[PDB]
């Protein structure tokens, strides 16, 4: 039995990061605009304010080149981001240089310090190499040199997201030596019942211990982990990694504690097309719930489905509800990376990528990000479960 099913279903949805092709495209106050927005992350702070982050991809939808880390906040701590007018204009966390600032992975600490882990690479490097930049420059492949590797940066805010520190490079401390490619998140980290922070990253968790907003960091290496991971604390208090697979098929799941994890294995209940997903601890009292969101397809990113598990170890999720049951118009084809938070008014708030697909899979396809709010009742009253 879930009493939430008896509440009135609630949903609303609208574009929050508007690509350059849309009416009223999102630009910074400096006039700097963006072809595409990708790679969402969202958190609710301890005040109730919502912070939404994304990669502002300047010139194309590509993963490399000039990409800035951008964000929006709710105007007040109490408005819950319910309508477009509730959100501030686009701001920038970091945009220095013509390199890539991305993979936003925020976590809100107990003191309300908001930590934001990020990945960086140089202006003339790309994951595969030999990619053509807008000016015709051909990229070098990301490699293990200081200049050519993926870095891990940390910034934080002490004023509810209003301002951000200059990002500090933590690569030598928190990325293993000899690495070339790297990734943190993207999506979110968590705070455990026992007080530690856990931030998911490629092949590892980053663990924060000690005083809120003055944490010491260490690395928990994980055998079999993916590049793009998610982390949740399940109702049993254990840790749960749910990672993007290297090949299309299913989410890769492992369970553990701060002392170690077991093996990663595909979750046959969670089809995935090799794309990022998101996971969220909703509540701990009966009935305890974990929420999961991804594209529920072995092939397509356009099958977004939000689900609930009542299991103490999140063994099984229900069918849930397709996001297309509450479709957004005028913002392209919804589907891709996502991020979820709980809102101050007992809703789930989700950011979800969308793709106009005007250039197909090509670099000129405009990408936007949708903001959704829905309650548990909305999920539970879905026509397929």
Ligand X SMILES: O=C(O)[C@@]1(O)C[C@H](O)[C@@H](O)[C@H]([C@H](O)[C@H](O)CO)O1
Residue numbers of the site for ligand NO2 (CB under 6 A)? Answer: 207, 218, 220, 258
Q: Which two tokens stand for residue 247?
A: 């090949």
Our finding on whether 301 is near ligand X (CB under 6 A) is: yes
Our finding on whether 357 is near ligand X (CB under 6 A) is: yes
Beta-strand runs (E) in 76-193: 91-94, 100-108, 114-121, 125-126, 140-141, 151-157, 168-169, 190-191
* 138 DSSP assignment: B
Binding-site members for substrate are 38, 57, 63, 127, 244, 301-302, 310-311, 316, 337, 355-357
CB nearer to ligand X: pick between 235 and 336 = 336
- Which part of the chain contacts ligand X (CB under 6 A), choosing from 7-15, 23-31, 161-169, 329-337? 329-337
Q: Considering CB distances under 5 to 8 angstroms, the limit depending on partner class, which of ligand NO2, ligand X, Na ion, none binds residue 326?
A: none
The CA dihedral of 280, 344, 166, 193, to the nearest 10 degrees, is: -50
CB contact burial 257-275 (16+ within 10 A = b; e otherwise): eeeebeebeebebbbbbbb
Number of residues that bind ligand X (CB under 6 A): 15
The full length of the chain comes to 385
Task: Please tell me the distance from the alpha carbon of residue 39 to that of residue 155, in angstroms, as a whole number.
Answer: 17
List 2, 63, 88, 324, residue binding ligand X (CB under 6 A): 63
Our finding on whether 336 is near ligand X (CB under 6 A) is: yes
Query: Which residues neighbour 59 within 8 Å (Cβ) at sequence distance 6 or greater?
Result: 35, 65, 66, 134
Task: Please tell me the distance from the alpha carbon of residue 99 to that of residue 155, in angstroms, as a whole number.
Answer: 17
Q: Considering CB distances under 5 to 8 angstroms, the limit depending on partner class, which of ligand X, Na ion, ligand NO2, none binds residue 258?
A: ligand NO2
Our finding on whether 300 is near ligand X (CB under 6 A) is: yes
List 21, 47, 124, 127, residue binding ligand X (CB under 6 A): 127
Q: Considering CB distances under 5 to 8 angstroms, the limit depending on partner class, which of ligand X, Na ion, ligand NO2, none binds residue 301?
A: ligand X
> Residue 23: is it exposed, middle or buried by C-beta count within 10 angstroms (0-12/13-18/19+)?
exposed
Task: Please tell me the distance from the alpha carbon of residue 3 to that of residue 25, in angstroms, as a whole number.
Answer: 41
What is residue 86's three-state secondary structure? Answer: helix
Per-residue x/- mask for ligand X, residues 140 to 179, rule CB under 6 A?
----------------------------------------
Q: Considering CB distances under 5 to 8 angstroms, the limit depending on partner class, which of ligand NO2, ligand X, Na ion, none binds residue 95?
A: Na ion
Taking the complex as a whole, how short is the minimal distance between the CB of residue 246 and ligand NO2, in angstroms? Answer: 24
Which residues of the chain form contacts with ligand X (CB under 6 A)?
A: 39, 63, 127, 183, 227-228, 300-302, 333, 335-336, 355, 357, 361
């Amino acid at each position: 039995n879930d009493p939430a099913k008896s509440a009135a279903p609630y949903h609303d949805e609208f574009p929050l990061f508007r690509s350059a092709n849309m009416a009223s495209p999102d630009k910074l106050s400096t006039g700097i605009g963006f072809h595409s927005f990708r790679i969402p992350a969202v958190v609710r702070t301890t005040t109730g304010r919502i912070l939404a982050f994304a990669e502002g991809r300047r010139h194309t939808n590509q993963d490399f080149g000039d990409i800035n880390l951008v964000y929006k906040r709710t105007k007040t701590t109490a408005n819950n981001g319910a309508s477009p007018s509730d959100w501030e204009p686009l701001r920038e966390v970091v945009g220095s240089g013509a390199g890539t600032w991305g993979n936003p992975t925020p976590v809100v600490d107990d003191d309300n310090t908001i930590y934001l882990f990020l990945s960086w690479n140089g202006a003339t490097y790309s994951q595969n190499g030999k990619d053509v930049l807008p000016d015709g420059t051909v990229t070098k492949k990301i490699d293990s040199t200081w200049e050519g590797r993926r870095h891990l940066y940390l910034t934080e805010s002490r004023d509810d997201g209003n301002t951000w520190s200059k990002p500090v490079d933590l690569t030598k401390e928190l990325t293993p030596d000899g690495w070339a490619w790297d990734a943190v998140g993207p999506g979110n980290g968590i705070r455990l019942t026992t007080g530690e922070l856990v931030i998911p990253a490629m092949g590892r968790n980053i663990i924060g211990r000690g005083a809120p907003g003055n944490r010491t960091w260490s690395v928990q290496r994980l055998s079999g982990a993916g590049a793009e991971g998610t982390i949740v604390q399940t109702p049993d208090g254990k840790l749960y990694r749910n990672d993007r697979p290297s090949q299309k098929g299913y989410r890769m799941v492992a369970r553990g504690t701060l002392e170690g994890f077991g093996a990663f294995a595909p979750d046959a209940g969670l089809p995935d097309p090799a794309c990022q997903g998101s996971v969220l601890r909703y509540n701990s009292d009966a009935p305890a719930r974990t929420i999961f969101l991804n594209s529920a397809s072995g092939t397509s990113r356009r099958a977004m489905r939000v689900r609930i598990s009542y299991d103490a170890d999140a063994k099984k999720f229900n069918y849930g509800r397709k996001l297309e049951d509450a479709k957004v118009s005028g913002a392209g084809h919804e589907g891709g990376y996502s991020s979820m938070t709980k809102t101050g008014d007992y809703k789930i708030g989700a950011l979800v990528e969308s793709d106009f697909f005007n250039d197909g899979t090509g670099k000129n396809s405009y990408r936007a990000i949708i903001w959704r709010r829905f309650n548990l009742s909305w999920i539970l009253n879905g026509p397929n479960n």
